[model samples]
Target chain A: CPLMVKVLDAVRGSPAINVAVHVFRKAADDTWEPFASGKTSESGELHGLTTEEEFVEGIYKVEIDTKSYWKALGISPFHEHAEVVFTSNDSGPRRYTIAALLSPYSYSTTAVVTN
Target chain B: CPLMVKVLDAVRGSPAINVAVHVFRKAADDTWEPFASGKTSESGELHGLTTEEEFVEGIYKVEIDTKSYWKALGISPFHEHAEVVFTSRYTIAALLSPYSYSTTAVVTN
Candidate 1:
């Protein structure tokens, strides 16, 4: 019951960089629902997700689309889009892991719960 | 006055990734104050910080240690640390530019 998210890729020399992670859920009067999506593995890992049948907390957003992955390596970036917002406390039933590391510029996200 | 945190590095092949960026201020009563710190440029740009003499809106926490930059590449990370929280709305006077990108098994702080 513990497994959140783990996606890592810090686009240095561009290890064939490909990143797209979106997990959103904000109800209770604030609309934002797009359960899950994943990508990043070549060394840039995106671990297993089994957040107790898929995470359900509140106020969560992780959107990283760096100018279409540096415009497919054409590389045009002053600043395009990188976002991370976190807040998850499901109250009970454990096992949670949320990790994100992205690069074109920078990115870092963490959420862990185990046992 | 617009210049809001710009830091970049996605350690694909490791461009000497050294990242340290902190800008915070939320005080009506919330309390969090340490408003600027910068590092990231072996090509992982940390651009001009002139957010009207150093940005100040509210609720911002960008803390990325990444298990001490992947333990200096000794590498030991199932997951250590990475954080990113954003919320800035100064009302007027605009130039907003907020960017971040990091990598090492993954990081977004």
Candidate 2:
């Protein structure tokens, strides 16, 4: 199964450009290791990240940072870290999406694994 | 677009089981930085690695090490580095499916 992620401006309903999203999976030992890291497109959508071992399921995390983007736009970001968490399983016809809604002041996460 | 990778035997034509496949996206500094890494499953396939920032494209790399598997079955991998490279574009698909295989390294970095 593959996880699709999208970062958006909460108030404006627009894609958050240039946001750096890093994905991590909990390994067998319970340590969080980075599985993928990349930046969002201009449209606020990420292409999607898959591993050589993409099928196995577990706890995954994505840390979204907007500090650099905020600084670039001359708006000091109030939040330090906007983190999101989700659970997954891709055994059947399943697609997991981690859509993150973010703003300078607040953030929210919506993760759904469709059957 | 995102990159999907798979590791398999050159001679066997089957998925390379339990293989470690690593993916790296080149940084602005021209140095290779590890973006994602994991092992192949019973299916010899990986789920997928997506970053917070996907779609912004560039040169990427994936490494497949078969030495351990080969040695376990009494074979020495002749080629230290079995690597593949690709170029990509957007709006359609940009997966070169390029790959690499190799080494017992000591990283002092």
Q: Which candidate wins on TM-score?
A: 2
Candidate 1, residues A23-72: lDDT per residue as tens digits? 66677777767767676566544555335556665666656565576677
User: All models, DockQ values?
Assistant: 0.08, 0.02
lDDT of 2: 0.56
- Over B10-76, each residue of candidate 2 has an lDDT whose tens digit, in order, gives 4565766776666666789976678777777776666566543663566655555554666656664
> Which lDDT tens digits does candidate 2 get at residues A51-95?
426736677767777656666677745443454544454557776
Give DockQ: model 1. Answer: 0.08
For model 1, what is the error of residue A85's alpha carbon versus the real structure, in angstroms, after optimal superposition? 4.8
CAPRI quality of model 2 = incorrect
A80: Cα error in model 2, Å: 2.4
Worst 10 residues of 2 chain A by lDDT: A78-87
In angstroms, how far off is A50's CA in candidate 1? 12
